[PDB]
Symmetry: D2
Subunit: 293 residues, 4 copies
């Protein structure tokens, strides 16, 4: 089957003002590359090439200008806007026509993932053509997230969005895989107390059909978010330490495309020319002559 | 005599791409506030209220939307563009009519200053009705900056822009105070071997007339630039550590305007309401009822 | 003349297991042992005669690291605090070290940075009467001695770790005292938590109208190293300054040289054994470079 | 059938003086725990319980006070001294009697590792009953390390210690596994030009026999090292960001013993007791009542 991608870069509102007055959070860099490269790279690693970027009226054109139609990176990028931040689950109504009768994956524009065998973690979720797949990650502050409770057998048995009394420390990450049933589930949602269409409700519909796979994203993986000024800074230092230690970049879309055989040497060479005088173009150039396992 | 301020927020070119592809360096935040807030606050602490922000064709309108006419902070802000990055001293040609017959001060849009008695450090440059004043600061890498040589008695005796063999470790910082001669010195300037109208040629012109005052910005002050992704990050951590230690912000313009008796408590409360839900608005609110010495 | 005391006590078990193998104040902040910072602070206050007080197990190690201090133009002595019975116990333990002189006490994990710091210390240190402390605006005053001011800015109360703090002004870990302090310490009774409190010593001066409270402004950095998190921030803060400037913060050898307590020959010989690393190279650079 | 471990916690000479004038590098903390906890945890994760710790004359006794005989953690620890820093390969001479007739592993006392499936990465190598196993990791500065060269088929064809002209960017990490041949190979080593018994000469002897296995430690793992004050600080920040995000600790030996079933609940409870009023003891207590996947 075919699986298409959606990145939701919703508005942070005025939460991070005045820092984000001139530029929305999702267009900020994390260290050396725009924030959106990280979730984009995650979809690419999941085998996904057709991707819809949804954001605000104001930012959607800015992403188009940054990313184009993606043909440079062997992708097919399209855009849509969410006129008002009416909940993450609205992504599937906005993208109904984009999705068609195909499988889909949703990732939030401000989630970074790092770790080993990430291709294989995602592959098993991409492989499932029936039901939904999500990931649970042990966090210190589960109250801020969708929370998954497990029984002593290891079976997911409940989900709650931002519970006052969380039942575990397992938060659901901002990467979701879905089958063809997601649009209709999305269409029947009602607004929560806060007036949002909630992705946790989508996820609960599958759980209540026994069609939700909840895989553990283990403690050896880094799932970071960019919610506060503080965490933005930590995420930047984290990526800076890996990259400077390794001489290898995290979530460089041009590299991922090249390693997936979606662009060839000659194309990557052309992508490197414009930035040949900075570290990034110099890095793309080096990938043409080095074996990296 | 009245002193007017100029902030040159010129381009970074393609130097920091792809990170700055969607947003220009000087519109990024440093931790919790826009970069430009820091040099703006520096001019405000120096007593300056009439300020011209010069940036690229693309960014000047964005600074204009972020900052407006300045009347909300008791400032008077105007705008002009630098069509091409033909050197820093071009700020005086672009700003000729804005400066008029008055004294002036230039600050770079990407310089952050911190330390004690900063009001007094600037005041003694601001008080000088004739001549020019600049600040020298000990750095690791003087070859990147304008460099000031001193003789055994502490007298400034030479300036070189980015010398290959620096004569000292003292860099001239991106904050400059000038009398009414500056525009005429700037109009006589011809381009250097790197094709720029050099602020260091302006400073040398004052030096060769015996009218340059070089004051030491002591090691107890922090002068950070934001030249690389690495230093941007260090800058962020540095401000974060001060702010979270003290519960006081560095370079909050609303606060400086309020402490300078330029806006009143009413106006401050009115600036605080729209941000009432985030830390920044709350901070502005707290300043209303706490005495800080 | 003023005598100096560095209280490098226990952090108890609260930074365990990181401090299982080492006293907190022997850990480094970036490139140098933590105690170099308060030591440098007392030196900057013009104090050369310094008593270092620590645990029985730690005191020999400070002694190994620092010696008699004569290499840096200082006069260092050592004494032990057998149980962590409170900060104000430094004066009882140090009674005979102090004698009839004026004194100062700095906490071994307090780090300070900023401009004119010599002058901020000079005013307190030159006083020949009463006591002097510094008040610093912090986010978390509950963790500290908290000074309350009236509308004229006069200090009117002090409280140790108040549950409901009267201000955001913490009293920093640097204290200057006239000859009254030892006798005030002697008459103290243990607090609820069973500690001889420095805040009780400072309240005794305040009640006599003999406490001077100066503001350490927001342009100074008073870091402390109370948690693993803050220790790390302190490390990052020092590193950023030093790598920016090419100058070191709280380098006692530098401070001794600049104070004229050791000469260029002496400094050169201190550089020799460290000449293969950045620290010794730094000292050798100081011989030839004028730094304003 | 036993694999025995060695942690070489040598002298960093005077390289990090004066910070290490009072204590050995490997007794410093990386964030919340002593540095040696990290490689210790690494040998524990590889299934190794009998471990010799080698440090200097001055430091060995201090490791003894910190760690004891290891019985509180289900381990069996011994201590020996390296009187002169005459090479890593010396660990096998000093450790000859400790190893006896068993298989062995050597880890450097300042090496930190983090990543997913690390148990499995270590498992394959520790399970081998022949030859030697080492890990190759892409770094920015291969000159500082042993460097492995591969042919176009990925086969290792040469090993060089600190080459002036590195043949690849793949460094051999400070984690080595050996069959019963290493002791005899070590004992026939002669000093290299810098007067050192080289672990790289040991690994080369196995390579020339066709008995060296080089596994790649992929980029999704973090091999941090702690060579400079700068890197030590970065390592601290890295651990801190992981631990505060997750509410789980990296390289907590008590946790590893418990999960390996080498100590029981009651024993973990007793270990928690004296640390109950810091975050580390509370964390041991929470591990009694939480299921962590
Ligand atoms: C280590 N890693 C990641 O954790 C990752 C992060 C975001 C998205 C995808 C991978 C990663 C990574 N594994 N790779 C290798 C790779 C990428 C694509 C196909 C085959 C190998 C890469 O080129 N860049 C990376 O950042
Ligand atoms: C400590 N400090 C500064 O270093 C500073 C930095 C840039 C611009 C202005 C001040 C600072 C500062 N000194 N003040 C106090 C202040 C501001 C204006 C008048 C009188 C006092 C402030 O309100 N905010 C600050 O950030
Ligand atoms: C900038 N500064 C300090 O903030 C400081 C901090 C702790 C202790 C002493 C000084 C400092 C400093 N001002 N000096 C200069 C100095 C040192 C001694 C006498 C006069 C000036 C120095 O040599 N090292 C320093 O770290
Ligand atoms: C994620 N991880 C590591 O990367 C690791 C790092 C150094 C040493 C051992 C493990 C790790 C880890 N996988 N575990 C789980 C574990 C520990 C022991 C046996 C089986 C699983 C753990 O308890 N702590 C950890 O830090
Ligand atoms: Cl894992
Ligand atoms: Cl200074
Ligand atoms: Cl101040
Ligand atoms: Cl990997």
């Amino acid at each position: 089957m075919k699986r298409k991608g959606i990145i939701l870069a919703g508005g942070s509102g005025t939460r991070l003002h005045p820092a984000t007055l001139a530029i929305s959070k999702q267009l900020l860099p994390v260290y050396d590359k725009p924030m959106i490269y990280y979730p984009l790279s995650t979809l690419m690693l999941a085998g996904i090439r057709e991707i819809l970027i949804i954001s605000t009226p104001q930012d959607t054109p800015r992403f188009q200008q940054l990313l184009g139609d993606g043909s440079n990176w062997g992708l097919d990028l399209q855009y849509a806007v969410q006129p008002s931040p009416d909940g993450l689950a609205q992504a599937f109504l906005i993208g109904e026509s984009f999705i068609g009768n195909d499988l889909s994956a949703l990732v939030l524009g401000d989630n970074l993932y790092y770790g080993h065998d990430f291709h294989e973690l995602l592959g098993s979720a991409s492989q499932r053509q029936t039901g939904a797949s999500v990931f649970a990650y042990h966090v210190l502050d589960p109250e801020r997230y969708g929370v998954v409770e497990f029984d002593q057998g290891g079976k997911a048995i409940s989900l709650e969005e931002k519970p006052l009394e969380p039942k575990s420390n397992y938060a659901v990450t901002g990467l979701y895989f879905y089958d063809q049933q997601v649009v209709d589930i999305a269409r029947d949602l009602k607004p929560s107390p806060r007036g949002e269409l909630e992705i946790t409700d989508v996820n609960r519909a599958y759980l209540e059909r026994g069609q939700l796979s909840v895989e553990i994203m283990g403690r050896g993986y880094a799932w970071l978010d960019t919610g506060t000024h503080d965490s933005l800074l930590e995420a930047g230092q984290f990526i800076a330490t890996l990259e400077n230690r390794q001489g290898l970049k995290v979530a460089c879309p041009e590299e991922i495309a090249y390693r997936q055989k979606w662009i060839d040497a000659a194309q990557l060479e052309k992508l490197a020319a414009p930035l040949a005088k900075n570290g990034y173009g110099q890095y793309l150039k080096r990938l043409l002559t080095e074996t990296v396992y």
